[PDB]
Design a binder for this molecule. Structure first.
Ligand code: HEM
Ligand code: HEM
Ligand SMILES: CC(C)N[C@@H](CSC[C@H](Cc1c[nH]c2ccccc12)NC(=O)OC(C)(C)C)C(=O)NCc1cccnc1
Ligand SMILES: CC(C)N[C@@H](CSC[C@H](Cc1c[nH]c2ccccc12)NC(=O)OC(C)(C)C)C(=O)NCc1cccnc1
Lengths: 462, 462
C-alpha cells in the first residue's frame, strides 16, 4: 500500500509487510527481540515498516558514523515524530533543524564539566539521604525494591539540580512537587495509544488541534507556573539548571520563557526513570556477581578511606566503577535504538537512501552481537578495562548515541549514577533474595525494563 | 450548513447560527446567561445550534411534562452523547433505551427509603469527623474554605456508603483510595476539549478507537481492581452500594461485573462534587442571611435538644431545613438544564418535533423566571413553606429533573446534605469574612460553581 514496495525495489531484505500494519505485529516480542532476529535473519542491513513508515536498519560502523556524525547537519538532523506534543515542540530533543541547532547551542554550556563539578556537592547530599533511607530498610530485614529507593533518589537529585527544591521524596511521596514529577514516565511505544499513532499517524494532527498531548496537560501546567514562581522569586533575591537557563537568556534570539520551561521538563523526563532504571540494572549485576561487587567495594575504600565522601575528581579516578557502569549499559542500553530522519535523497557508504526514510541503529542488538563481543550475554566488566577498552568500536557501543545529537546529559547522568553507587556500596552489600528474579527477564514491552521489578537483600557493612 | 435551516423552516425563533460553530460563541457568558437572555429575547420556545446539532428549548410546564413523563419511554428516552466514554458506556446515566431501562430497574431498589434509612448511621459518623475538623479550624481563627472541608466530608460519605472504606480524607488527602476518587470531577462542557467535541463530533469515534476516554483511564483502572479485591474479600467473609449491587446480581440478565464497576464509578462521580458544591452554596446563604441561619439553628435544637444526633426520621421532621435546602437549589440548580434526545418524528402540545433534535429544559433560567417567582434573585426560603409549597409547579422547579429518568440519587443526596447541615450548625455559626465574595458571582464556565470559592468565618457555639 502507497509505499510498501520501497525496500523490495532497492534490493534490501526484510520481513514482508501486511497492509496498513506493515510489520508492527512483529513487535509482539519487543523491539529488542525483533531487532536481534532481524540482524540474525537478514545480515548487515534490513528494512521494515512501522505502518506505512519505512525504516532502514544499519549495522556497519562506517555507515553509522556518516549518519550520526558526518552528515548529521546536512542530512540526518532530526528524530521521528511520535505523537502530539503541544508546546513541548520546543524541547531540544523534540525540536528540529535550526531551532534544534539554536537550542543545542543555547543549552550546551549548562552541561560542561565545569558546571557539573559545581553540581556534585548538591548531588552528594542526597546520597546521604539515600543511605539513611536504605539503612532504615536494612535494619528491618525486609527485601528492598530498588526502583523505589533509587527512584526516590533520582527524584531528589532532579528536584535539586534543576530547581533548588529539596525534598526527601521517599518520605514525602505526597508533596505537590513530587507528585507531578512522578508522572513524567517513559513512553511505552508499544502501548495501545502509540501503536495506533503508528497505524493512524494522520491522527496526530487531529489530537494537536484538540490540545491533547502525550505530556499530561496537568503536569506541564503545574511546572509552568512552579517555574514562573521560582523565576520571579530568585529574580530578584547559583547553581541549578533553571538558574543556568535564566542566566543564558540574559542560535542567538535568547531563550524564550516557554522555551525555557520546556527544556526544564525534558530534563526531568530524561533524568528520572533512566537514572532509576540504570541504577537498578547495576545493583542487579553487582548482587548476582558478588566478586564484581567485592572488587568494586575494595576499589572504593582505596580511593575513599574511612568512607570518605566522593568528590568529582575521586569519582573520575575509579576505573573498575567506570567499567562496571559501562558494561551494564552494554547489556541494557535503555534507548535500545537510535533513529534519524533522512531529509534528502542521499547515497552513503555505497547505498542509496530515498528522502523520508527513518534510519535506525539497533543499539541493543549491536550490544549483544557475537561478531563484536565474545560471550555477549555474560556480564564481564573487564571488556572495558583500560587494556581492552581500545578494541571497542564507538559506533557499535553507543549507550548515549554519538555525534552532534548524542545525549547532552551524558556526563551528568554518569556522574549522578556513580555518586550513588559509591555512597551505597561504601555502606551496604547487596544479595539475592528468593523473590529475586534470577535470571532477570526483560520486558516484552516497548521499554527496556525488567519483567518483574528487581528485589534484593541489603545488609549493612556494620 | 447541512442542517442550519431547520428552525427557520419550522417558524421557531432563535439566534442566527454561524457556519460550523452554530451558536457556541454565545456561550462566552455561560449556559446560564445564554439561557436567560434567550428566554427573555425569544419567549416560551426558542432554538439554537450546538455546532450542527439543533437544540429546541421549552418552558411550558405542560410540554415539559409530556417530554419528561408521558412520552419518556416512547420518544424521549436518552440524553445527548458528549464525548468518548469507553466502558462507562454501561453506566446508567450514560446508557440508553432497553439497557438503560434494565439498568434503572436493576439499580432502583438500592435507592429506596428503606436502604437509605440503613445508611443513615454510616453517613452520621462522618458528620462527627466533619465537626472535629471544623472545630480544628475554628479554634484557630482562620477563614475556612467550604469546598475543601465539605469536599472532605462528601468524599468520606462516598468512600463509606459505596465500598465500606473508612477514611478521614481531609487528614489522609494522600491515601491511594482518596487520591483517585478526588480526580472524578464535574466535566466543564465549555472547556477546550468539549467545545471541539461539539464542532467536531465526528472526532468522538476516532478517540473511541484509541481507547481515549473522558473518564481518565487510570482512575477507572484503579477502581476496577479495587472493587474486584473488595468483591472477592467479602465473597466470602451489609450495607453499602457495592454490597447492594453484589446482592442484586445474585431487565433481568443480572448485573455484569463490568456493568457493576461502572455504576459504582458513576455514583462517586455524581455524589462527590455535587454534595460538596450544594453544601457550599447553602452555607453561603446561611452566612449572608443570619436570620435564616438563626431560625434554622433554633429549629434544629427543638427537634434535637442537647445536640442530640440526627436520625432519619428527625431529619424528615425539620421543615425549615427542607425549605432552606430547596430554595438554595432554586437559585443554584447545578444541572442547569435537562436534556432529552427526540428519537422519532413527534408532535407534542401542538408543536411538530423532527427526529434527532435535542429537547432542552433551561432549569436555571426557569428557576429565576420573574413570571413564576417574585423577586427571583432574593434568597427567600418561605417560598417553600408548607403554605406556599403548593403554588410551585414541579415542572418549573426541577433541581433533580422529573420523570422516569430523574436523579435516582435524590433522596440520598438530600439526606446526605441535611445530615451535614444539622451536625455543623448544632456546633458552629458561619459569618462573612472580608475575603468573602459578597455578592457571590457565578462562574462564566460550563459549570454551576462560584467565580471565587466561598470563604467564611466559623465560630464555635462554645
Ligand atoms: C543513564 C542515563 C541516560 C542514558 C543512558 C541516555 C541515553 C540517551 C540517548 C541514546 C539519547 C539519543 C542520542 C542520539 O540520538 O544519539 C539521549 C538523548 C538525550 N538525552 Fe539522554 N540519556 C540519559 C540521561 C539523560 C539525562 C540525565 C539528561 C539530562 C538533561 C538527558 C538529556 C538528553 C537530551 C536533551 C537528549 C536529546 C539531545 C538532542 O537531541 O539534541 N539524558 N539520551
Ligand atoms: C445535590 C445533589 C444532586 C443533584 C442536585 C442532582 C441532580 C440531578 C439531575 C438534574 C439529574 C438529571 C435528571 C433528569 O434528567 O431529569 C440527575 C441524574 C442522575 N443522578 Fe443526580 N443529582 C445529585 C446527586 C446525585 C447522587 C448522590 C447520586 C448518587 C447515586 C446521583 C445519581 C444520578 C444518576 C444515576 C442520574 C441519571 C439517572 C438516569 O439517567 O437514569 N445524583 N441528577
Ligand atoms: C521516547 C521519549 C524518551 N521521548 C524522547 C524523544 S528523543 C530522545 C530519546 C528517545 C528515543 C531513543 N531511541 C528511540 C527509538 C524510538 C523512539 C524513540 C527513541 N531518549 C531515550 O533514550 O529515552 C529512553 C531511555 C528510551 C526512555 C525524549 O525527548 N527524551 C528525553 C530523554 C529520555 C531518556 C534519555 N535521554 C533523554
Ligand atoms: C455531565 C456529566 C455530569 N455526565 C453525566 C451525563 S447525564 C447526568 C446529568 C448531566 C447533565 C445534566 N444537564 C446537562 C446538560 C448538558 C450536558 C450534560 C448534562 N447530571 C448532572 O446533574 O451533573 C452536574 C450536577 C451538572 C455536574 C452523568 O453521568 N452524571 C452523573 C451525575 C452527576 C451529577 C448529578 N447526578 C448525576
Amino acid at each position: 500500500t502507497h509505499s510498501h514496495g520501497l525496500f523490495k525495489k532497492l534490493g534490501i531484505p526484510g520481513p514482508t509487510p501486511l497492509p496498513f500494519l506493515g510489520n508492527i505485529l512483529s513487535y509482539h516480542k519487543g523491539f529488542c527481540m525483533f531487532d536481534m532476529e532481524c540482524h540474525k535473519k537478514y545480515g548487515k542491513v534490513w528494512g521494515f515498516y512501522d505502518g506505512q513508515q519505512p525504516v532502514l536498519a544499519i549495522t556497519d560502523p562506517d555507515m553509522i558514523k556518516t549518519v550520526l556524525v558526518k552528515e548529521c547537519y546536512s542530512v540526518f538532523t532530526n528524530r521521528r515524530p511520535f505523537g502530539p506534543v503541544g508546546f513541548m515542540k520546543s524541547a531540544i530533543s523534540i525540536a528540529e533543524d535550526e531551532e534544534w541547532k539554536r537550542l543545542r547551542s543555547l543549552l550546551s554550556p549548562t552541561f560542561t564539566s565545569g558546571k557539573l563539578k559545581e553540581m556534585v556537592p548538591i548531588i552528594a547530599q542526597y546520597g546521604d539521604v539515600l543511605v539513611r533511607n536504605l539503612r532504615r530498610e536494612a535494619e528491618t530485614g525486609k527485601p528492598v525494591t530498588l526502583k523505589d529507593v533509587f527512584g526516590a533518589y533520582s527524584m531528589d537529585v532532579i528536584t535539586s539540580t534543576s530547581f533548588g527544591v529539596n525534598i526527601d521524596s521517599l518520605n514525602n511521596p505526597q508533596d505537590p512537587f513530587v507528585e507531578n514529577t512522578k508522572k513524567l514516565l517513559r513512553f511505552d511505544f508499544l502501548d495501545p495509544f502509540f501503536l495506533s499513532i503508528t497505524v493512524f499517524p494522520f491522527l496526530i494532527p487531529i489530537l494537536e488541534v484538540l490540545n491533547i498531548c502525550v505530556f499530561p496537560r496537568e503536569v506541564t501546567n503545574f511546572l509552568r507556573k512552579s517555574v514562573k514562581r521560582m523565576k520571579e522569586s530568585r529574580l530578584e533575591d547559583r547553581v541549578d539548571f533553571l538558574q543556568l537557563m535564566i542566566d543564558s537568556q540574559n542560535s542567538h534570539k535568547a531563550l524564550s520563557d516557554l522555551e525555557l520551561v520546556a527544556q526544564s521538563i525534558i530534563f526531568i523526563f530524561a533524568g528520572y526513570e533512566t537514572t532509576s532504571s540504570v541504577l537498578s540494572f547495576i545493583m542487579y549485576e553487582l548482587a548476582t556477581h558478588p566478586d564484581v561487587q567485592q572488587k568494586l567495594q575494595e576499589e572504593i575504600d582505596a580511593v575513599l578511606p574511612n568512607k570518605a565522601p566522593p568528590t568529582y575528581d575521586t569519582v573520575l579516578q575509579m576505573e573498575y566503577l567506570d567499567m562496571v557502569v559501562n558494561e551494564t549499559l552494554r547489556l541494557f542500553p535503555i534507548a535500545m535504538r537510535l533513529e534519524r530522519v533522512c531529509k534528502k535523497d542521499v547515497e552513503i557508504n555505497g547505498m542509496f537512501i530515498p528522502k523520508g526514510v527513518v534510519v535506525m541503529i539497533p543499539s541493543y542488538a549491536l550490544h549483544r552481537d557475537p561478531k563484536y563481543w565474545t560471550e555477549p550475554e555474560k556480564f564481564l566488566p573487564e571488556r572495558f578495562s583500560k587494556k581492552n577498552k581500545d578494541n571497542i568500536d564507538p559506533y557499535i557501543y553507543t549507550p548515549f548515541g554519538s555525534g552532534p545529537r548524542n545525549c547532552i546529559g551524558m556526563r551528568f547522568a554518569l556522574m549522578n549514577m556513580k555518586l550513588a553507587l559509591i555512597r551505597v556500596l561504601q555502606n551496604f552489600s547487596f544479595k539475592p533474595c528468593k523473590e529475586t528474579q534470577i535470571p532477570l527477564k526483560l520486558s516484552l514491552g516497548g521499554l527496556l525494563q525488567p519483567e518483574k521489578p528487581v528485589v534484593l537483600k541489603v545488609e549493612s557493612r556494620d
